[PDB]
Design a protein around this ligand. Structure first.
Ligand SMILES: Cc1cc2nc3c(=O)[nH]c(=O)nc-3n(C[C@H](O)[C@H](O)[C@H](O)COP(=O)(O)OP(=O)(O)OC[C@H]3O[C@@H](n4cnc5c(N)ncnc54)[C@H](O)[C@@H]3O)c2cc1C
Ligand SMILES: [Cl-]
Ligand SMILES: [Cl-]
Length: 423
């Protein structure tokens, strides 16, 4: 256990760092400081303003089982109050189809879903635990498609792909099942399939800005950390404006990047070097022939269509001059990765093909997205190692790499970090 008097440095004012501060504070750890590199809080919950309304450059949605986020809202006073999500499906040629009504493929898919639900309820019990420290079944360490194939459930990929590949998380040929099924566990998949999805009028960012404000120590912003060292049982942080000592270090920032400004030991260097991530690019667009509904494009979710628009978000139905965001991936382990420029051109051409041509791109962002490890590295015990290192030289590891790249998962992980190590 850790002394309540400890000076605790939390790096990153995204959901993970903000949650860490919240749950530390509610456990009686009052001497924490959150250090944020940018001038803003919420990280990839990022909801900029346009014509009196906030649009989403990052996270958009939750589901009713996001219990930790509910706890945050309980604290902040925020309410789930955004516009209803609705979707149609488009082929890569822009034609509308209704796959749930396909009388051959539909049943095959839902039968596979049924079958997978029972394997999850019986054989793979534990799969849905937050984090990876409870070692998942070995089958879950395989790429999702391989995991499905082993169990005869390939068809279920049709349901699972839409809120996964399109949402930036990569491709089932390579992404381990462990990640997929921690995010899209059975209740979560059911909620999404049904459209029972939380959104916020003021943006996902708002409740995090509000959480920060409720904190006893709101985040320090514009903190440029040049160096962290950990001699003599302490943590020393060097920034461009000061350098100070803490007792405990909580990392919610990318761990491979941490290597470059830290006295990283051999294990840290070895293991964090294996972290891979996604290049998920979002374009905030003004369009003609305004869509009446969000569009998903499964055809463009295939690795062979890397860089094409996989989904676009219809957020403000009443105003045809409001922002439509588009979503595409720029990388895949087995395909040549795509440039920003050539992908920008695909946004334009695909949106035209869909009959919603772009008048203007007002904002573009390639995000550092979904840090994870390969199936091989997962099977080789990556998480047993790294979780084994928790508390080493008073350093604790958290954020997306330790759980999943979603704001409930990381917040939940931070909450549990306090329980596991601090209380
Ligand atoms: C387009 C898009 C769609 C998404 N959709 C959803 C969704 O619908 N549902 C969902 O649950 N999640 C979604 N997400 C994922 C979700 O937003 C993230 O998983 C969540 O924000 C992770 O929180 P975090 O604190 O772990 O990481 P981040 O949000 O990335 O926050 C990291 C923070 O650390 C800071 N930082 C980085 N480096 C340093 C440094 N050197 N020093 C100090 N500070 C540093 C950053 O500025 C940032 O504030 C989406 C994200 C994007 C981009
Ligand atoms: Cl104490
Ligand atoms: Cl949707």
């Amino acid at each position: 256990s850790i002394s309540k008097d400890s000076r605790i440095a939390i790096i990153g004012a995204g959901p993970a760092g903000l949650a860490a501060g919240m749950y530390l504070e509610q456990a009686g750890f009052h001497d924490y400081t959150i250090l944020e590199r940018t001038d803003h809080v919420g990280g990839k919950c990022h909801s900029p303003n346009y014509h009196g309304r906030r649009y989403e450059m990052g996270a958009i949605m939750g589901v009713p089982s996001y219990d930790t986020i509910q706890e945050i809202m309980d604290r902040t006073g925020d309410k789930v109050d955004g516009p209803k999500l609705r979707r149609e499906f488009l082929h890569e040629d822009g034609e509308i189809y209704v796959p749930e009504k396909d009388p051959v493929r539909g049943p095959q898919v839902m039968a596979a879903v049924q079958k997978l639900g029972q394997l999850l309820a019986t054989k793979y019990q534990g799969y849905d635990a937050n984090g990876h420290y409870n070692k998942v079944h070995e089958d879950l360490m395989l790429p999702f498609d391989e995991f499905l194939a082993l169990n005869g459930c390939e068809a279920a990929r049709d349901l699972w792909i839409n809120p996964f590949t399109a949402f930036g998380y990569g491709h089932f040929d390579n992404v381990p099942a462990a990640y997929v099924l921690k995010y899209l566990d059975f209740v979560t998949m059911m909620s999404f399939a049904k459209g029972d999805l939380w959104t916020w009028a003021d943006g996902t960012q708002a409740m995090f800005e509000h959480l920060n404000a409720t904190l006893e120590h709101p985040a320090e912003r514009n903190v440029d950390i040049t160096r962290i060292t950990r001699e003599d049982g302490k943590v020393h942080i060097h920034t461009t404006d000061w350098d100070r000592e803490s007792d405990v270090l909580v990392l919610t920032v990318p761990l491979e990047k941490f290597l470059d400004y830290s006295d990283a030991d051999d294990d840290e260097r070895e293991y964090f070097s294996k972290i891979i991530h996604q290049q998920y690019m979002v374009d905030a667009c003004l369009v003609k022939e305004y869509p009446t509904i969000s569009g998903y494009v499964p055809d463009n979710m295939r690795p062979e269509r890397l860089g094409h628009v996989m989904v676009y978000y219809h957020r403000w139905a009443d105003d045809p001059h409001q922002i439509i965001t588009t979503y595409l991936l720029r990388n895949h382990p087995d395909y040549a990765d795509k440039t920003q420029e050539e992908c920008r051109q695909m946004v334009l051409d695909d949106m035209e093909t869909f009959g919603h041509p772009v008048e203007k791109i007002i904002e573009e962002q390639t995000w550092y997205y979904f840090p994870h490890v390969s199936s091989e590295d997962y099977k080789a015990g990556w998480y047993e190692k790294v979780e084994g290192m928790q508390g080493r030289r008073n350093t604790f590891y958290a954020g997306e790499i330790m759980s999943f790249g979603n704001f409930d998962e990381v917040c939940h992980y931070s909450k549990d970090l306090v329980t596991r190590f601090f209380v």
